């Protein structure tokens, strides 16, 4: 969380993964041959994340939204396996592997390739929809003398509108 990517570490597990590919740490690779040092992708283990947000096919967009609604999650991560995200999953024989509740955001707000996305903005828009308040009115009363009297009268006047009024004074804390 200091930089975009972390370090690649050679360990017994990198070797176990390389052996299954026919390689080990002292072998030379053919030009442009790729060898994986990990079984799975994770930025915290030295992998990468590429933004593909604008390359997703409209039918696949529809399907992903339907998955979140069927499960019942508001914020959801969906794990998809496909050879081409730009074609319908039925053409590429892709599958949905998992739905993840409470997904993290690092890979979307700090990708290693492609453009960063403002992920928080859609979250705050559901919590505080456009046009709605996030605050209640605050009336603060000060001065050397008369604060308690002014405070009780003002709370009394607001209360005649039928709202729940809370107030604090030197005598006590009250609600309605």
């Amino acid at each position: 969380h200091d930089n975009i990517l972390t370090k690649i570490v050679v360990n017994k597990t990198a070797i176990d993964v390389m052996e299954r590919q026919g390689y080990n740490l002292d072998s030379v690779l053919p030009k442009d041959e790729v060898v994986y040092l990990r079984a799975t992708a994770n930025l915290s283990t030295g992998g990468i994340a590429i933004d593909r947000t604008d390359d997703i096919h409209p039918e696949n967009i529809w399907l992903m939204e339907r998955v979140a609604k069927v499960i019942g999650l508001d914020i959801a991560g969906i794990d998809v396996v496909t050879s081409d995200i730009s074609k319908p999953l039925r053409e590429t024989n892709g599958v949905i592997v998992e739905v993840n509740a409470a997904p993290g955001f690092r890979m979307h707000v700090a990708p290693s390739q492609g453009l960063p996305r403002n992920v928080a903005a859609p979250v705050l828009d559901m919590l505080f929809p456009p046009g709605t308040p996030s605050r209640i009115p605050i009336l603060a009363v000060t001065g050397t003398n008369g604060k308690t009297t002014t405070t009780r009268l003002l709370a009394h006047i607001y209360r005649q509108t039928g709202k729940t009024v809370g107030y604090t004074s030197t005598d006590a804390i009250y609600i309605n």
Partner: peptide, 4 residues
């Protein structure tokens, strides 16, 4: 997690 917290961060799946």
């Amino acid at each position: 997690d917290d961060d799946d």
